[PDB]
Design an enzyme around this catalytic site. Structure first.
Site, PDB file in Angstrom:
ATOM      1  N   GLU A  11       0.816  -1.364  -0.050  1.00  0.00           N
ATOM      2  CA  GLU A  11      -0.049  -0.010  -0.121  1.00  0.00           C
ATOM      3  C   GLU A  11       0.581   1.464  -0.048  1.00  0.00           C
ATOM      4  OE1 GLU A  11      -3.171  -0.032  -0.235  1.00  0.00           O
ATOM      5  OE2 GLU A  11      -3.747  -1.950   0.346  1.00  0.00           O
ATOM      6  N   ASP A  20      -6.638   6.469  -4.357  1.00  0.00           N
ATOM      7  CA  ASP A  20      -6.031   5.203  -4.369  1.00  0.00           C
ATOM      8  C   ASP A  20      -6.363   4.850  -6.052  1.00  0.00           C
ATOM      9  OD1 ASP A  20      -8.762   4.356  -4.928  1.00  0.00           O
ATOM     10  OD2 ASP A  20      -8.806   2.937  -3.118  1.00  0.00           O
TER      11      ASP A  20
END
Ligand code: CL
Ligand code: CL
Length: 164
Positions: A11, A20
């Site tokens: 991540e 994202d």
């Protein structure tokens, strides 16, 4: 290597609100703020999550705290899910970490949807599960990350993360 280290690789870490892979407002170590298109709504969720007026920026410690909460919640989501729990119980420690990664990324509901793959994992049919996991929007949208998780399920080792 462990779940925390693995997810930190997968991540990344960002201290300011960002979008994202799906275009959603996120912060820290993959902490989704909202699916809403509004930055204000994201700023709002952020303040409520940290407990202070952040103005879209948090510190390293804050990011870590959200991360700890998030991992804890993924585990709990698994244990509470009737479809996930049994798989999780059947697996070794390394593979359990791969399942946690998937839940962290896509949510309990999303993962519980991989019915056929889950059955295969439970049966310990590694190569077959790997192939099945790959026939998914998940693999097509984030292939490099998906490949790391899949290899983890296939081999039961952390090899895909060794180098990174
Ligand atoms: Cl939260
Ligand atoms: Cl990717």
């Amino acid at each position: 290597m462990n779940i925390f280290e693995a997810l930190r690789i997968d991540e990344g870490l960002r201290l300011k609100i960002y979008k994202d892979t799906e275009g959603y407002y996120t912060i820290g170590i993959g902490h989704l703020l909202t699916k809403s298109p509004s930055l204000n709504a994201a700023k709002s969720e952020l303040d409520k999550a940290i407990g202070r007026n952040t103005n879209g920026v948090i510190t390293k410690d804050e990011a870590e705290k959200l991360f700890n909460q998030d991992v804890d919640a993924a585990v709990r989501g698994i244990l509470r899910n009737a479809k996930l729990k049994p798989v999780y119980d059947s697996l070794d420690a390394v593979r359990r970490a791969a399942l946690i990664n998937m839940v962290f990324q896509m949510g309990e509901t999303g993962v519980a949807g991989f019915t056929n793959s889950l059955r295969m994992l439970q049966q310990k049919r590694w190569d077959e599960a790997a192939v099945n996991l790959a026939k998914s929007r998940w693999y097509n949208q984030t292939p490099n990350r998906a490949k790391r998780v899949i290899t983890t399920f296939r081999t039961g080792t952390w090899d895909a993360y060794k180098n990174l």
